[PDB]
Amino acid sequence: EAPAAVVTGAAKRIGRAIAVKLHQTGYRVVIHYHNSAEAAVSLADELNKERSNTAVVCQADLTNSNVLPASCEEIINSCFRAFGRCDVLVNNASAFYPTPLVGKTVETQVAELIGTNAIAPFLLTMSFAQRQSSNLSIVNLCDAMVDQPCMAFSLYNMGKHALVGLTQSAALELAPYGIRVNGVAPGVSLLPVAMGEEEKDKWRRKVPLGRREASAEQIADAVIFLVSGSAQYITGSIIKVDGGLSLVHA
Amino acid sequence: EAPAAVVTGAAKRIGRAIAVKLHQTGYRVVIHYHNSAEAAVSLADELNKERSNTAVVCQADLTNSNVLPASCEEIINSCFRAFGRCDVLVNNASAFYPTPLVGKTVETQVAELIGTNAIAPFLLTMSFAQRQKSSNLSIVNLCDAMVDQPCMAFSLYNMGKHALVGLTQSAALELAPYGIRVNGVAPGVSLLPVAMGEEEKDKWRRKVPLGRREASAEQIADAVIFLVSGSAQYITGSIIKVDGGLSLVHA
Amino acid sequence: EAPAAVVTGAAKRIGRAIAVKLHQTGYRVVIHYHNSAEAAVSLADELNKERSNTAVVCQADLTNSNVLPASCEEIINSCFRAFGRCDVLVNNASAFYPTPLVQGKTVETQVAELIGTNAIAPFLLTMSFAQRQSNLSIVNLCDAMVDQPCMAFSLYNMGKHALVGLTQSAALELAPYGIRVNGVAPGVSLLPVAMGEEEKDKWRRKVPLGRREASAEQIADAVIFLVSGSAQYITGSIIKVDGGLSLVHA
Amino acid sequence: EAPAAVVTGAAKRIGRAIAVKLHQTGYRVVIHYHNSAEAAVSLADELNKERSNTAVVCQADLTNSNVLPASCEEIINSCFRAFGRCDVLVNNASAFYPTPLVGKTVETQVAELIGTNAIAPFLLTMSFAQRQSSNLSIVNLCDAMVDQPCMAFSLYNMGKHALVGLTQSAALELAPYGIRVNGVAPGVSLLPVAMGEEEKDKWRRKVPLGRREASAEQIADAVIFLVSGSAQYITGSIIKVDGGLSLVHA
């Protein structure tokens, strides 16, 4: 029988390429999404046409709130409902936008940025572990530039830093149960859709290895590695997939 | 004119030492507290006896909520109403208890652990900076030397502290044009809880290479004083471990 | 044309496992050795029995000296001589013994062996590899406990820290050449043969994931990943393969 | 009776500022130098005019060699000969120049860059500990950009990384003797004397805090803090003095 994986924010971009790769490797997949229903449903279609009954979608808002624990429990429950098991959780979903220190409210910014990048991954990891020959692991999508952050992205960056803490804390605490917890940290990969083309080339130009961004597929490749049987002693590790960007001084 | 500092969680232990040392250095102080009113007030009284009109208290819950931004704005405001200025912010208040992965609800634990250790520091930072829109302005965040070697089953506390490292760095960067520095002090094991059995206290003490003892609160305060001083005027984004070598010790 | 790899200190233990796995993946290999000639040759025998003329041996002392550059140049030359190309360099060879700061070999000899094997030779090999020039990369065998070092092992530890520096400096500088430079950081893997059985279990008990050491093969798996096409955007990354050991406080 | 300190490379620039501030704080000082004899004795003259018999010079090459240990022993011996004690060691002396991976032989480059930045600090630390109310400590002059290194400076950067490892290893090992071991990490401070003003300004403009370099005194201030009784629990800590430079992305 085929293992199953939850991938959050899996309708588009890196999350999508992660879901695809997991599926190609043999996994059944829960494709989580928030707003991107059309793209999510379309992906499940593609996957299931390849292998029958191997993908479902699951809608949820991962903003922090008093119901987030229930929403995260339900995402994991949805994997068990479809597939009878849940072997892999990928925390990929992420809000990303500036929150300068000097008309969404600040309480909403805090809820979205810290919810998606950190609180939801924690709650998802909690529900994953509680619901548990096997190779169980979590992969968090981190940030190679977590210590060289974007100007005015302090809440986003606080979420990402918290996610490093979670990766490590959960690696430690869940090791006795055979669950591995690891990270994959992009630098510059798929550029924001809203970003103008000049700012895009500015980012590309900073990357030592080839002066270009990572493909989504290259990011997924590192995910696939950490969930595989070639990573069975790896836990609490965060692999940069950044073409050396984090090594470049100002 | 004497400069002024807000210290959060200043009624007791490390925050108290910090407020006292800042006061001794010449600061006027806002002693923020949550539940420890009597201790906060007894410290304000002690300090006002040293120099009249140099210490006020300010009560607030720093748990994450819809009212937290207003609370933090009001803590900053309190310093201005009291003293005409706000030169130093020390983010010291912190909830600390286990939250294992496998009576409070988890959403409450999130609110308390992430709110005290991380979001309230961010909101305080915004309000501090907004009000400042040869002075020596800075923020010091109380971090954790053991942030990458966490206590078992403290994932939320640890997430909070990690987030605080990110804030320290993101704020250093963003506020540098305003001349506001932002740094941390990262204690290892300090002032152990009076109620912890001495036998449990000694298990921790025995791990510390430098003197096989915990840091005093005053030792933690000494690093804060350095960071706020004119001797640290090019230092920003730096987190100073004050840990007796504990973090260098493998399992 | 199969690609070709150099693995230093490849006669035994982790380096052996690395050469074997590389070979199984389709590489031709240079098995470098210092003292273990008999073991180097029986490995080459085994490998060339699977596939004729795909394994050669190469002897060198990697102690720092006036001749070390020439020796390192020649290790690279041997790969080009045997196989016409050099795709991968694995810096595995390492001296490891205590050098107490407060009070056999002179201190200057200790400096030479510990800093030479763990840092200077890797630098010189890196120079010669890059000079002599597809999916080219280098993988340095690091130390997950580089920041929580063994007591009285300051020279070894300085060497491994230097090797971090080299990993990152060389990733930056050789990215324009398409040469990726990465590391693999074991925590507790194969225990030193000299170690007493009870001390061995003292170390095993520290590891959260399984209370045991990584096998050499598990270390090698991370090496294989980094040299593969599935790591083509990864450079300057050091992957811990430590079972969570570096996460554990005193 | 007044404490005594050894400062390596103390004839000028940051080591001179350190010597001066230690002296102002009441230390007697050994001003080590290599080539800058005139500057060294000019400094000791000023200091001795301030308080007589409180400064001496001490010449030594800190390039790695088989006599380097004797040379480092003699530097420490010199402090005891002049002042009857040695309370503080500041490892400031450093060679700094490029060593491209693709004048001096490589053997010499290795000896100078690794000897000054790491091996001599190790040996001086051994000698300092061996010769030993008190507040004993060592401060190593590190590099805030140790993980975002200058292009083509691999040997220098290897040296500085090793120095991080020594700082940590030695803090651990010497803590039972009550000797603290810490570091101070400039980012951009006094620009190299051969730099033209234009290239100077290029480095200045990178610094968030003030778009300028740290003064020599600003670095010394962090040293004096670490040696002071205000840092009596600090060991194994490296204090960046970089105006935010290491936090700035490419």
Ligand SMILES: NC(=O)c1ccc[n+]([C@@H]2O[C@H](COP(=O)([O-])OP(=O)(O)OC[C@H]3O[C@@H](n4cnc5c(N)ncnc54)[C@H](OP(=O)(O)O)[C@@H]3O)[C@@H](O)[C@H]2O)c1
């Ligand atoms: N792209 C990069 O270069 C880069 C760099 C560093 C790190 N990363 C990390 O890599 C991961 C993937 O990056 P990406 O660029 O593919 O991500 P992205 O496109 O910015 O976000 C991926 C998905 O997150 C979901 N999401 C946003 N807010 C949410 C909410 N409140 N509740 C639930 N879901 C929400 C969105 O889902 P819907 O579309 O369904 O609403 C979105 O499609 C992220 O964690 C990111 O932080 C990426």
Ligand SMILES: NC(=O)c1ccc[n+]([C@@H]2O[C@H](COP(=O)([O-])OP(=O)(O)OC[C@H]3O[C@@H](n4cnc5c(N)ncnc54)[C@H](OP(=O)(O)O)[C@@H]3O)[C@@H](O)[C@H]2O)c1
């Ligand atoms: N002690 C250590 O060994 C150690 C180790 C690593 C890091 N640190 C860090 O150093 C700092 C000081 O440590 P500590 O041991 O002195 O702290 P602590 O005694 O655990 O807590 C300090 C104060 O935090 C305040 N606080 C707690 N929850 C709060 C809430 N919801 N809202 C507002 N305030 C709240 C409390 O104020 P009231 O009493 O007024 O309710 C308390 O007295 C903390 O940031 C801690 O994380 C300490």
Ligand SMILES: NC(=O)c1ccc[n+]([C@@H]2O[C@H](COP(=O)([O-])OP(=O)(O)OC[C@H]3O[C@@H](n4cnc5c(N)ncnc54)[C@H](OP(=O)(O)O)[C@@H]3O)[C@@H](O)[C@H]2O)c1
């Ligand atoms: N084993 C672990 O748990 C562990 C933990 C952390 C890091 N690592 C790292 O992973 C790597 C592999 O570890 P390992 O335990 O397999 O290594 P090891 O057995 O300690 O040594 C590997 C080989 O290094 C070679 N070597 C030693 N001194 C040399 C010299 N002066 N010149 C040339 N070669 C020399 C020896 O080759 P000859 O036998 O041919 O003389 C030896 O067989 C090392 O880089 C190590 O530091 C290992």
Ligand SMILES: NC(=O)c1ccc[n+]([C@@H]2O[C@H](COP(=O)([O-])OP(=O)(O)OC[C@H]3O[C@@H](n4cnc5c(N)ncnc54)[C@H](OP(=O)(O)O)[C@@H]3O)[C@@H](O)[C@H]2O)c1
């Ligand atoms: N300057 C900066 O902005 C900066 C940035 C990062 C880190 N740092 C670190 O802070 C420290 C001080 O920097 P700096 O710019 O003041 O240093 P520097 O001027 O580059 O060097 C200081 C002294 O090092 C001594 N030295 C060089 N080679 C030597 C050898 N073979 N043997 C013995 N001594 C030797 C020289 O002494 P003589 O002149 O007597 O020959 C020189 O005056 C260094 O460790 C540096 O790496 C500085």
Ligand SMILES: Nc1nc2[nH]c(-c3ccc(Br)cc3)c(-c3ccccc3)c2c(=O)[nH]1
């Ligand atoms: N969720 C989500 N998270 C993201 N984090 C980054 C990023 C990139 C660099 C630095 Br420094 C810090 C963060 C980007 C991004 C990707 C390309 C260009 C710019 C930003 C990005 C995104 O798009 N979506």
Ligand SMILES: Nc1nc2[nH]c(-c3ccc(Br)cc3)c(-c3ccccc3)c2c(=O)[nH]1
């Ligand atoms: N706010 C607050 N934060 C804290 N963090 C720690 C700490 C941090 C890292 C490790 Br690893 C272990 C404990 C302690 C602590 C330290 C020693 C004994 C009991 C508690 C502590 C505390 O008391 N109040």
Ligand SMILES: Nc1nc2[nH]c(-c3ccc(Br)cc3)c(-c3ccccc3)c2c(=O)[nH]1
């Ligand atoms: N070359 C070589 N390098 C080594 N480094 C470590 C090591 C492990 C832990 C800490 Br902390 C620091 C160093 C070991 C080792 C392996 C197993 C047990 C103990 C030490 C080891 C070895 O054998 N050969």
Ligand SMILES: Nc1nc2[nH]c(-c3ccc(Br)cc3)c(-c3ccccc3)c2c(=O)[nH]1
């Ligand atoms: N011994 C000595 N060591 C040094 N290290 C740095 C430095 C600074 C930044 C990066 Br990135 C890497 C290294 C400089 C320097 C100082 C100012 C401008 C440029 C370089 C410098 C020096 O001068 N003398």
